[PDB]
Design a protein around this nucleic acid. Sequence first.
RNA 1: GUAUGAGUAGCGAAAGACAGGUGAGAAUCCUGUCCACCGUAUGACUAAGGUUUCCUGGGGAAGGCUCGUCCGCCCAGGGU
RNA 2: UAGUGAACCAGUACCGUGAGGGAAAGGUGAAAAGCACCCCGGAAGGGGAGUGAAAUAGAUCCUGAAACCGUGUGCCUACAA
RNA 3: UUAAGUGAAUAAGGGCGCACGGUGGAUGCCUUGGCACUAGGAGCCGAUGAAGGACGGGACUAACACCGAUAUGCUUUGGGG
Lengths: 43, 123, 112, 56
Amino acid sequence: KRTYQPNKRKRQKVHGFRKRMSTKNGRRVLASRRRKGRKVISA
Amino acid sequence: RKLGRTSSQRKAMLRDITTDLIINERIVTTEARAKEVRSTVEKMITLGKRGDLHARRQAATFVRNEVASVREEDESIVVESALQKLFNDLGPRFAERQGGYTRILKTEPRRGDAAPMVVIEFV
Amino acid sequence: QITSAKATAKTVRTSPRKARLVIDLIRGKSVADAISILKFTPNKSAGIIEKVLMSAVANAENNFDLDVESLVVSEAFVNEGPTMKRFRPRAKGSASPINKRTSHITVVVTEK
Amino acid sequence: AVPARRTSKAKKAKRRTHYKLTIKGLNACSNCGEMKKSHHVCPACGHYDGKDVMSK
RNA sequence: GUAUGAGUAGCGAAAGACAGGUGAGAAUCCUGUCCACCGUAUGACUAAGGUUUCCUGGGGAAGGCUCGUCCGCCCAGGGU
RNA sequence: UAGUGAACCAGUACCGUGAGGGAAAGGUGAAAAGCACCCCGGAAGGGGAGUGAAAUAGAUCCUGAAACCGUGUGCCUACAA
RNA sequence: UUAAGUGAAUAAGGGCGCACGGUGGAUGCCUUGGCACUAGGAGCCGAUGAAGGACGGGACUAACACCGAUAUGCUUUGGGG
Ligand SMILES: [Zn+2]
């Protein structure tokens, strides 16, 4: 067993969007990426 | 002897090559396979001159069981089973001939393996 | 008034070393020996340089010369083309590159 | 183990005096004069001992 | 960017043979015949996971540890 | 190889589940007038003939150094540490 | 004729010089992008739905830009020919 075993749920109920619009730290994450101009905001 | 492959694969190879030339009379293969075909086939046509039951019940081993060779019909379909061609056709050709029933020629090497190649006929 | 037509081949997928072995066997020899020598070698660089000699003879016919029966290979070159580069996954994580080379081949056919 | 130093340009060449390709015997045809290998079937002719074999 | 070692190491566990095809070209592609290997599985259905590789007709510059007329590769058209 | 990381479809391709980390890449000619036609070859590639003042300016396209790989030849070398 | 003595040249390959090619892009020259500032404007946008985005719009649509089911755009007022 090596590591990166994917799921379609868990990579959107941890690293999604709605769990970065839930705190005052996901908002730091999104506004820190928008000042990099990156296309993919979050997975 | 000449070692070519594993132990009990030479039996299968020399059965399977030498049921050709019973059918075709031409084979385009390499050097060493042809020399073992020399030895085995000229041991086999000598059984083609007895016609006994020992001629059947020893040639039945080293020839494939199956193999069709069908070129005759008038109002029939007659099927030579490629052992019957020893005892009906290949036998009584060389009945006055002694040993030396084969010819080996030297053509070319192969395209991808550089293996020099060889034709075999009978007469 | 010129003898000595030419013909080249560019970026042919072989080595530069192995092609210099066949061209050891062609300098100084006539055309009649050369095609006969090239027919009976089992190498990749055998069947390539034949096309170069036949195109050089065809240049010498349809452009300048005559006298096919008196043509001599005078010059023969093997040069280094651009080299393709790939990688191979070697054990314990790392890798090691692989050069893949090509060559430029020119052959000159003079009369005498 | 591991080579001690670079071999120079001289010992590149002084090895390779035994890395030659050569061609062994070539003979004319029976019937055309074209160069063909001894003890071998003629590819451009089909003849051997002045007799065509590669035919039906 | 290019050497050196060096045309050395290696080509990643296994049984193939012949005849006839298309082709510029064939151990490697297509067809035929025999032989051989697994068979609580190298066989059938599905859940994740992958995201067009599935199908048809073409092509051979690169990928395929060799070749390659072939391909899960490229072109173009379609299928849930 | 400077100047923003980025003169070019760059916070891109790529790497890590994630926060994140982050490249190489400009120039034919004045104008595409970018080689009709013939020949070898399956093609690529080439040789003529043409355009162009110039093709050793032919799409890897101004100039083209060095390591490196080749061809031909004036002189020397097979009792030498 | 015999004896005694002296004895050059040839290169499987190699070294040095010259001459001619190939691989590679240093240097020479150039601007389409930068850097640091100067004078002035401006120093907010949002429940009338913002910033940033997803999906779609062309005869041909893979991308960029522009736009929005009125979708490569509509109305009006001046300039322009
Ligand atoms: Zn002949």
